[PDB]
């Protein structure tokens, strides 16, 4: 089936509009925070557009009005409170009001969030080093919708001292939960309960394995469902061919996994066919990596050939998907899998990762926001005995409030396409990047790969981890080249250092720009350099004298290097 979206020209179309900060009046003690310059010192250098309202004391709020042709009972807000200072988080709240009425207490929690860097590798309490994630979201429904000339207000109360922050509200009005289908199972058939706290886990399971002896779609209705550890859908040894697993939207049905151990939340697919899954939002009990071990992402393991995840809302986990197998010699790949459709946001990791030779696959029509690495990529590993990953497309998605590396990146294999869409406000990276710096396959055999399409706003850096530039695109040719790329229809507006940079010596072949707009960059002041002599941002920049690139119809505007461009010498650019 076909799950039918118009889409937008560029980014993702989704049915909720956004009431951000310079919508909203501020009053009762609220204040504006601002972070121009992209200072990754403040907490505003996360927010979107580097802007958030403050709720510092009792009675402080931001309040927006609905628009005309606007409204609706589903909001979400991103929000930021304080870390504990054993890092486990605080819990807290804020109040929503309507009209004047007050309307809900939300809960709130710094539990998920806040990261800390003294080095490329987080760490879990504020003595580790300086934050990122400090930004959260929360949603919730209300009992009647709002409607255009209804305020929202969201205000701090005397409840604690801390200090709030909120970015904005994203407004929509929510479908009536989705029907069980016909001659299906539900969970509920096999003994869980919705909204009483009790583990769900042991019902799933044997729905299960209800659904896949019957060849009946798996329902979960509305409500929320908790699950005590990782849910595991087939095992190694006795993988599923296909199963349809339909919760009743990713407004009614919540899974909420329960246990903060490593390997011990998140959904295992063992499936070798089809899988479709769908209509779910799913929350971890998630708030570290464990240096990479944690084994709980949203999605993992085997997706099979043709399977869809699609109009999932899934945050705070590990990656949001990992697409891999690890349990076969040689390696087993998902083929032509499609996530659509879906809320990827607030995981510690990347948004979707397309590993060990997953192919042919695409990420669309997605929103993918605030993930703690790259938000899509594909990286083309080779455990087992994987083959390339080839023919991945990410298109049509809105990427926004990346914390770390790149909204969108390719790290090896052929044929991968990025298009159509909108990548903005990333911290300490680039809206684009591709290196060579992992293990498995690069570039030899790429056939080309295309980036087209594309707005990008306010991304790019002068401070990644190692305490160094990177372009909104950023091209490194860490050991291997990089080798047939072009990139068409680009817009490259606001960046904070240089719009697109070149480095490191591996190599430069076949990299073609064709109707590229730079508007704006430099935008963050820094001249400090970690790879050159100091230097304002320019439009184009290179500190590698090894390699070549083709610009066809460039323009620029508002460079702060007067030169336009910075090139380091050997460096063969052609402008025409
Ligand atoms: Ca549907
Ligand atoms: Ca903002
Ligand atoms: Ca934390
Ligand atoms: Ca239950
Ligand atoms: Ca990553
Ligand atoms: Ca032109
Ligand atoms: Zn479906
Ligand atoms: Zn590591």
């Known amino acids: ?29 609220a204040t504006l925070q601002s972070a121009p310059n992209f200072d990754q010192a403040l907490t505003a250098s996360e927010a979107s557009g580097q802007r958030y309202i403050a709720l510092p004391s009792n009675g402080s709020y931001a309040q927006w009005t609905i628009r005309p042709g606007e409204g609706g009972d589903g909001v979400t807000m991103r929000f930021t409170m304080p870390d504990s200072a054993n890092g486990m988080g605080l819990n807290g709240s804020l109040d929503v009001y309507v009209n004047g009425v007050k309307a809900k207490t939300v809960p709130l929690t710094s539990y998920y969030s806040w990261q800390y860097f003294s080095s490329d590798h987080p760490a879990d309490t504020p003595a580790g080093g300086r934050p990122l994630f400090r930004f959260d979201e929360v949603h919730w429904k209300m009992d009647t919708p709002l409607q255009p000339g209804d305020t929202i207000r969201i205000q701090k109360s005397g409840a604690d001292s801390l200090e709030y922050g909120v970015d904005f509200l994203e407004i929509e009005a929510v479908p009536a939960a989705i029907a069980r289908p016909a001659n299906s199972v539900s969970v509920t058939d096999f003994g869980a309960v919705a909204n009483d706290g009790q583990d769900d886990l042991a019902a799933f399971e044997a729905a299960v394995n209800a659904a896949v002896t019957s060849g009946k779609i798996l329902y979960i209705p509305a409500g929320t469902f908790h699950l005590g550890n990782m849910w595991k859908i087939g095992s190694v040894a006795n993988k599923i061919n296909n199963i349809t697993i339909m919760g009743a939207g990713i407004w009614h049905t919540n899974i909420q996994f329960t246990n903060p151990n490593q390997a011990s ?25 464990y240096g990479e071990q944690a084994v709980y992402k949203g999605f993992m393991d085997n997706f099979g ?18 697409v891999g197998d690890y349990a076969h010699t040689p390696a087993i790949i998902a083929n032509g899998l499609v996530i659509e459709n879906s809320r990827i946001r607030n995981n510690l990791a990347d948004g979707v990762n397309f590993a060990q030779g997953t192919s042919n696959s695409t990420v669309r029509n997605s929103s993918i926001r605030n993930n703690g690495d790259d938000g899509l990529a594909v990286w083309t590993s080779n455990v087992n005995g994987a083959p390339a990953g080839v023919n991945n497309t990410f298109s049509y998605n809105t990427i926004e409030n990346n914390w770390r590396a790149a909204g969108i990146a390719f790290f090896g294999g052929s044929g991968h396409k990025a298009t159509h869409n909108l990548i903005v406000d990333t911290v300490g990276g680039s809206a684009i990047r591709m290196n060579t710096v992992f293990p498995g396959y690069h570039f030899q055999n790429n056939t080309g790969i295309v980036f087209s399409d594309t707005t990008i706003i306010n991304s790019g850096t002068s401070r990644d981890l190692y305490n160094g530039e990177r372009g909104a695109i950023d091209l490194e040719a860490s050991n291997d080249p990089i080798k047939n790329v072009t990139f068409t229809n680009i817009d490259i507006i606001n960046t904070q250092r240089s719009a697109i940079q070149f480095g490191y010596g591996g190599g430069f072949e076949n990299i073609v720009f064709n109707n590229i707009n730079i508007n704006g960059a430099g935008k963050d002041g820094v001249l400090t350099s970690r790879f050159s002599s100091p230097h304002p941002g320019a439009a184009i920049y290179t500190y590698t004298g090894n390699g070549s690139a083709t610009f066809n119809n460039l323009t620029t505007n508002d460079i702060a290097h007067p030169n336009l461009y910075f090139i380091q010498n050997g460096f063969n650019l052609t402008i025409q």
């Open 1 to 29: 089936h076909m799950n039918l979206v118009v889409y937008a020209q560029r980014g993702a179309s989704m049915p909720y509009t956004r009431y951000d900060t310079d919508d909203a009046a501020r009053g009762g003690g």
């Open 265 to 289: 939340g998140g959904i295992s697919f063992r499936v070798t066919g089809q899988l479709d899954f769908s209509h779910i939002y799913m929350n971890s009990n998630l708030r570290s990596r």
């Open 305 to 322: 050939t043709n399977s869809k995840v699609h109009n999932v809302w899934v945050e705070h986990f590990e990656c949001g998907f990992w």
